[PDB]
Copies of this chain bind each other. A is one copy, B any other.
Amino acid sequence: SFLDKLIETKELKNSLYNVLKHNFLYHSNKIEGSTFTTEALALLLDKNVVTGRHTLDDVQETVNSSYVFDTVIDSLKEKITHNFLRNLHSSLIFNTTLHEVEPKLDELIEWYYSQSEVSIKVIAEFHYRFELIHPFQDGNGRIGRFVMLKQMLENNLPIKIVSWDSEDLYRNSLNSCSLGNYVPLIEYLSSLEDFREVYKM
């Protein structure tokens, strides 16, 4: 019923859609080095206004992140494919200084769509394996987290947004992980509060 509210509340101001978009894009972009503050990003999303000091790459990648988010929500229920992911990537790196993999990725995808039920463990494993394959030059973190959110929303799972911190718990969690051992990432994701339960109002 949550997804229903997300789609229905899309056009109204300060809604579930806009809040989720803001938090997710804020943390996900801040991990990758965006210098947008919460108010600067909110201002950019809402009124298309840029404030504070930023590189051109930061701004363009941010705007692209907004478009990619919208594309991800609009293209829910779609099967994750390589050309799909490349569409998201090229949409993400548009107008920037950028302007063995396929079989392993296909294997990962099949593994994902062979599950009887999807859980935080499955999503986390998909995340680490996707990062391990590393199909793209950059944005594997961003694209990967987008896919992660997509998977969470599609399967009515609790919405956990990877949050930036001062000790870098996310990256360290991915590092401590290894093949066959995804427990640190699962612990990290479980550590995070459910977004559904934060803004239940």
Residues of A at the B interface (CB closer than 8 Å) are 44, 48-57, 59, 63, 95
Q: Which residue of the partner chain B has the closest CB to A57?
A: B48
A49 to B55, CA, bound (A): 5
12 A-B Cβ contacts within 8 A? A48-B56, A48-B57, A49-B53, A49-B54, A49-B56, A50-B54, A51-B53, A51-B54, A56-B59, A56-B63, A59-B59, A95-B95
Q: Can you name the residue of chain B whose Cβ is closest to the Cβ of A50?
A: B54
Q: Contacts of A48 on B, CB cut-off 8 Å?
A: 55-57
A63→B95 CA distance, assembly (Å)? 12
A58–chain B nearest beta-carbon distance, Å? 8
Q: What is the minimal beta-carbon distance from A51 to any residue of chain B, in angstroms?
A: 5
A130–B24 Cα distance when bound, in Å, is 49
B residues in contact with A95, CB < 8 Å:
95
Q: What's the Cα separation between A44 and B57 when bound, in Å?
A: 12
Among the interface residues A53, A56, A57, A63, which one has the most CB atoms of the partner chain B within 10 A? A56
How far apart are the CA atoms of A88 and B46 in the complex, in Å? 31
Nearest Cβ on chain B to A138's Cβ, whole angstroms: 18
Query: Is there contact, CB below 8 Å, between A59 and B50?
Result: yes
A53 contacts B50, CB within 8 Å? yes
Q: Complex formed: what's the CA distance from A44 to B49 in Å?
A: 17
Name the distance in Å between A159's Cβ and chain B's nearest Cβ: 29
Contacts of A44 in B (CB 8 A): 56
Q: How far is the CB of A40 from chain B (nearest CB, A)?
A: 10
A49 to B50, CA, bound (A): 12
CA distance in complex: A52, B49 (Å): 10
